[PDB]
Ligand binder design. Structure first.
Ligand SMILES: [K+]
Ligand SMILES: [K+]
Ligand SMILES: [K+]
Ligand SMILES: [K+]
Ligand SMILES: [K+]
Ligand SMILES: [Mg+2]
Ligand SMILES: [Mg+2]
Ligand SMILES: [Mg+2]
Ligand SMILES: [Mg+2]
Ligand SMILES: [Mg+2]
Ligand SMILES: [Mg+2]
Ligand SMILES: [Mg+2]
Ligand SMILES: [Mg+2]
Ligand SMILES: [Mg+2]
Ligand SMILES: [Mg+2]
Ligand SMILES: [Mg+2]
Ligand SMILES: [Mg+2]
Ligand SMILES: [Mg+2]
Ligand SMILES: [Mg+2]
Ligand SMILES: [Mg+2]
Ligand SMILES: [Mg+2]
Ligand SMILES: [Mg+2]
Ligand SMILES: [Mg+2]
Ligand SMILES: [Mg+2]
Ligand SMILES: [Mg+2]
Ligand SMILES: [Mg+2]
Ligand SMILES: [Mg+2]
Ligand SMILES: [Mg+2]
Ligand SMILES: [Mg+2]
Ligand SMILES: [Mg+2]
Ligand SMILES: [Mg+2]
Ligand SMILES: [Mg+2]
Ligand SMILES: [Mg+2]
Ligand SMILES: [Mg+2]
Ligand SMILES: [Mg+2]
Ligand SMILES: [Mg+2]
Ligand SMILES: [Mg+2]
Ligand SMILES: [Mg+2]
Ligand SMILES: [Mg+2]
Ligand SMILES: [Mg+2]
Ligand SMILES: [Mg+2]
Ligand SMILES: [Mg+2]
Ligand SMILES: [Mg+2]
Ligand SMILES: [Mg+2]
Ligand SMILES: [Mg+2]
Ligand code: NA
Lengths: 272, 92, 48
RNA sequence: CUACCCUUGGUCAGGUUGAAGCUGGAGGACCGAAUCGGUAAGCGUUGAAAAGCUUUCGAAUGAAC
RNA sequence: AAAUGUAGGUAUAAGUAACGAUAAAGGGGGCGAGAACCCCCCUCGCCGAAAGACCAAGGUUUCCUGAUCAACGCUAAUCGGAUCAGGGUUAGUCGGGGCCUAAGGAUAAGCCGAAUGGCGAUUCCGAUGGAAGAACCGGUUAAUAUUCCGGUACUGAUACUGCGAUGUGGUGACGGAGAAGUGACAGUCCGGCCGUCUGACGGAUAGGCGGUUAAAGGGUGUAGAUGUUCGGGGUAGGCAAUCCGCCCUCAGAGUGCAACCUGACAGUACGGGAUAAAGGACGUAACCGGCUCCCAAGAAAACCCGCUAAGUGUGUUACCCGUACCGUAAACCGACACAGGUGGUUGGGUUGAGUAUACUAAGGCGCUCGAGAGAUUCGCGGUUAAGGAACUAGGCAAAAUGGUCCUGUAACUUCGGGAGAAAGGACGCCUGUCGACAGGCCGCAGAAACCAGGCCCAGGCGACUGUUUAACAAAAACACAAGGCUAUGCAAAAAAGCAAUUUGAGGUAUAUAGUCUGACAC
RNA sequence: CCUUUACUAUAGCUUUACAUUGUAUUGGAUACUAACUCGCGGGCGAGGACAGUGUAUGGUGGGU
């Protein structure tokens, strides 16, 4: 699912890119795209609040349907497309009544399949059902946190979650990070994993590819002056002391979850 | 007070000597072509066929005293009027 | 070599013109100080 | 002015090599004008210039101008 | 009488430095009190992908003409971008603006906040972009010219000879790279026609010189290109999402080529005439918003077309602003008539791979101090016996190499490289034969000038291309692709803010943030 | 101007008390919903007297 380049140039020696073999169409749908403006990490006051953001290719935004509200109406998969806004691929659906939508492409979903959403839908790859109607032990993605809100969790390329147990008004789900938490049974999920699992095997190869992706170079704290960073200064190379940020936040184990967040009632086992 | 004065210059005398229906006036800088055709026709009682216009800012006249006392002449508009073929105008 | 003043009439009025001075309290404070001094040139909108 | 960013435009003679898929024509690939710089030497130091000139040199389809 | 004290004036150094790129001048006439410099003519020299031509920004009368030479002009000046006066810029189509929206800005309802105020729409403003309203060639002035005149076009309104938006659809509507085939203009050559001349010295009534022109618009559908392919949306509709009967891309797009064309330029002759002054061969993307490949996946709204809801002919006419002149500069940014900087278009001929290089046309210039003389010394250049790095901190600088084609290329290697490794040979002209072959000719030298790699062996550091101390440091410093650790379950952590709110991100652990290490091998 | 285990403060973070803040069973827990908080669509969900905020207070605090 990847393509390794031959070492003709020093910039191409270690470069690995995707094969783009699941893609079936070259251009997006007209009614589902809009031009997207870039922030350089600046907020509405114009100050740069996030560093290392800037440049890159112009991109159009694609409208992804994370709610899957057209319940009971069948849909058919027409094309599988490239999407610059996310690490996974996307699939174009034509509903039987005339609506069109984009969804995250599950692994194993191909052109010509039929998909559905609702409580009375078959548990098949690409189908959206409430957790109450999803069998135990299934592989699922696009997990709602609240009913009616829309998919928020388990959406990146190659990601999946397993539904482990039922607890009445709550289910138990194991997340990609290893955490185990309770989710409401009226929420919705899509069967299968997220596709493009070989996305983590890519190697950019050269500094230039980072700039195409919109990233700017990142400076170490030990090579600055004390006025800019607590880790700076010194005659020759120094270690800089305890690793910390520009505001002095310890970078080697300080926990930052608020210790009185209410959602801790639902987190059964933790890994993050 | 649209028309300020006619133009009697070397260039305009030659233009009239070729096109007998062609004359030129000085007019208020903020008058439009439709108004100017009305004024030349309501005062000389002719058939105006075409009007061309140009706007001149005044010439700066900077004198010196204790220096740079700026001066300027008033801006004006030039109208070149073409009459109906066969009609003339007499400035005397 | 390239020097500090590269004129642009559109930029000049946007940054210093009469309508930009009147848009804020501190700009109108500047206009009041220049009037009280008796300046002949009030803003860059006058020299034009 | 300068540093970075946002939107919208423009520019890059000629030659060479020959990746993926005899053909094909990739590349922060090569040589080299415009152009962007500023390596070394000489000159200038009440200078033509409050940072330049001449020769030489680097990049020149890109993290380009 | 003194504070490196302040203002104004005047000294000294001194008739000294200097008069701003070493592209260059000489002669004859002229006006004039006055001429190295001004005007005219002959010769010479410089630029010519510019030092020529057309715009934008910026400037704002510097543009043309008459008068003037006090000041300005690094000299003088009869001259000037100087002083004074007069004159000069002409648009239904060009460029703007009127229409539309981007970044951003101002707001409405709301939110926040000692005050001043900060935020906040699908609203409005705002081009550097999009417009379904449309013109090109020539000629005339001392100074304007798609604007005036000529010719030939086009686009709105207007007068006389069932409609369908404020809602909601369609369109508009978009990247990079690559080459090919077809084939204009320009340009070159050959060859006719028209006019004109007979050029210091030997030769030529056969030659020299100038011409022989063209756009928009209209036509054709040619080269060439593309097309043989019953559920998903816009038209028959109700406030875009559970239907049914109905007309198709089988033709689109398109150079070249007709016509526009009995215009025009130069030169002779006298507004008119020669003058209705043949044709070829190459060359040739201006077909092309096309074709092919790739990943980094390539604005918005309006104009223009739908839908329902609610309800041809003629004539007249086309408003506003810009339009001079400079613009790789003496007119803009640099205090200067300053060797610097300044976006876009065009840019002939021979040579060439070329927009490099050399020489030239059109056009523009000889750079606002000269004349003598030819010491020392300095700046920029040229040559040099014998030696050849002995110089010096150091081969610094200079010399040397350098082109095309044909041979031939090592260690090592991440298998790509190293590599143009290194080292060699041929190169002009004439004759013939099938770029080559052979014979011959000339010279010291055939890559002929200009142009145009020096190479090799071995170490330290950094993997690499990049970035940096504007103005003494370009590096072994920074960044980097990549590796680890830690935080973060989504009103995420983190950042900004008094807050509201925004970034993160409209991303969701193959993700985001902090931090250290820095390709790769072990 | 810079540094820190110099001194004294302080933004921020964090602890408890009072207010916001109620009701049952058995103080301290369990339970409830009506304060209060978030989501959907134009009432239904999910939480809940916690959380957040004001005042007071201990700790931390070269970030300043
Ligand atoms: K770094
Ligand atoms: K600090
Ligand atoms: K620099
Ligand atoms: K004169
Ligand atoms: K003719
Ligand atoms: Mg440092
Ligand atoms: Mg040390
Ligand atoms: Mg007219
Ligand atoms: Mg006008
Ligand atoms: Mg390169
Ligand atoms: Mg160069
Ligand atoms: Mg190189
Ligand atoms: Mg190069
Ligand atoms: Mg002194
Ligand atoms: Mg002396
Ligand atoms: Mg002397
Ligand atoms: Mg001097
Ligand atoms: Mg001297
Ligand atoms: Mg001079
Ligand atoms: Mg020029
Ligand atoms: Mg003049
Ligand atoms: Mg003088
Ligand atoms: Mg004058
Ligand atoms: Mg127009
Ligand atoms: Mg608007
Ligand atoms: Mg002119
Ligand atoms: Mg013309
Ligand atoms: Mg609008
Ligand atoms: Mg002009
Ligand atoms: Mg001069
Ligand atoms: Mg430049
Ligand atoms: Mg060009
Ligand atoms: Mg040429
Ligand atoms: Mg040249
Ligand atoms: Mg010698
Ligand atoms: Mg010798
Ligand atoms: Mg020695
Ligand atoms: Mg010695
Ligand atoms: Mg050297
Ligand atoms: Mg390096
Ligand atoms: Mg480098
Ligand atoms: Mg420096
Ligand atoms: Mg340096
Ligand atoms: Mg390091
Ligand atoms: Mg301190
Ligand atoms: Na045509």
């Amino acid at each position: 699912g990847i393509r390794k380049l031959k070492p003709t140039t020093p910039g191409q020696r270690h470069k690995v890119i995707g094969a783009f073999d699941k893609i079936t169409a070259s251009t997006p749908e007209k009614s589902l795209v809009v031009g997207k403006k870039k922030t350089g990490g600046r907020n509405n006051t114009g100050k740069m609040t996030m560093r290392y953001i800037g440049g890159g290719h112009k991109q159009k935004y694609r409208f992804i349907d994370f709610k899957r509200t057209k319940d009971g109406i069948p849909a058919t998969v027409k094309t599988i497309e490239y999407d610059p806004n996310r690490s996974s691929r996307i699939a174009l659906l034509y509903y039987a009544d005339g609506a069109k939508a984009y969804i995250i492409a599950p692994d194993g979903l191909e052109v010509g399949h039929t998909v559905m959403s609702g409580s009375e839908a078959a548990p098949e790859v690409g189908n959206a059902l409430p957790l109450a109607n999803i069998p135990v032990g299934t592989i699922i993605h696009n997990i709602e946190l609240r009913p009616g809100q829309g998919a928020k969790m388990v959406r990146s390329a190659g990601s999946f979650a397993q539904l482990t147990s039922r607890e009445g008004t709550y289910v138990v789900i194991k997340m990609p990070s290893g955490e185990v938490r309770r989710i409401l049974s009226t929420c919705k999920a899509t069967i299968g994993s997220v596709g493009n699992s070989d996305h983590a095997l890519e190697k950019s190869g050269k500094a230039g590819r980072s700039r195409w992706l919109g990233r700017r170079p990142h400076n170490r704290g030990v090579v600055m002056n004390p006025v800019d960073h607590p880790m700076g200064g010194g005659e020759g190379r120094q270690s800089g002391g305890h690793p910390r940020s520009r505001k002095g936040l310890y970078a080697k184990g300080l926990k930052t979850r608020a210790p009185k967040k209410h959602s801790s009632k639902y987190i059964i086992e933790r890994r993050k | 007070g649209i028309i300020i004065k006619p133009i009697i210059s070397e260039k305009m005398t030659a233009v009239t000597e070729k096109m007998s229906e062609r004359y030129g006036f000085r007019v208020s800088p903020n008058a439009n072509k439709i108004e100017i055709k009305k004024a030349v026709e309501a005062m000389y009682n002719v058939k105006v066929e075409d009007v061309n216009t140009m706007r001149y800012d005044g010439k700066r006249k900077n004198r010196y005293t204790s220096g740079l006392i700026r001066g300027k002449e008033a801006s004006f508009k030039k109208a070149i009027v073409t009459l109906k073929k066969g009609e003339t105008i007499d400035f005397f | 070599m390239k020097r500090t003043y590269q004129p642009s009439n559109r930029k000049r009025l946007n940054k210093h013109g009469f309508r930009s001075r009147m848009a804020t309290a501190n700009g109108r404070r500047v206009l009041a100080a220049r009037r009280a001094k008796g300046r002949a040139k009030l803003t860059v909108s006058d020299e034009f």
